[PDB]
């Protein structure tokens, strides 16, 4: 269970950092 939950949690965090760098490069284009 913990293996599964941690895997899903890192998948979530990776998607989150994807969106963060994405908004970052968007703002960069606005610059």
From Swiss-Prot:
Protein name in the entry: Troponin T, cardiac muscle
Recorded disease: Cardiomyopathy, familial hypertrophic, 2: A hereditary heart disorder characterized by ventricular hypertrophy, which is usually asymmetric and often involves the interventricular septum. The symptoms include dyspnea, syncope, collapse, palpitations, and chest pain. They can be readily provoked by exercise. The disorder has inter- and intrafamilial variability ranging from benign to malignant forms with high risk of cardiac failure and sudden cardiac death.
Similarity-based family: Belongs to the troponin T family.
Coiled coil regions, renumbered to chain: none
Residue spans crossing the bilayer: none
Expression sites (tissue/organ): Heart. The fetal heart shows a greater expression in the atrium than in the ventricle, while the adult heart shows a greater expression in the ventricle than in the atrium. Isoform 6 predominates in normal adult heart. Isoforms 1, 7 and 8 are expressed in fetal heart. Isoform 7 is also expressed in failing adult heart.
Function summary: Troponin T is the tropomyosin-binding subunit of troponin, the thin filament regulatory complex which confers calcium-sensitivity to striated muscle actomyosin ATPase activity.
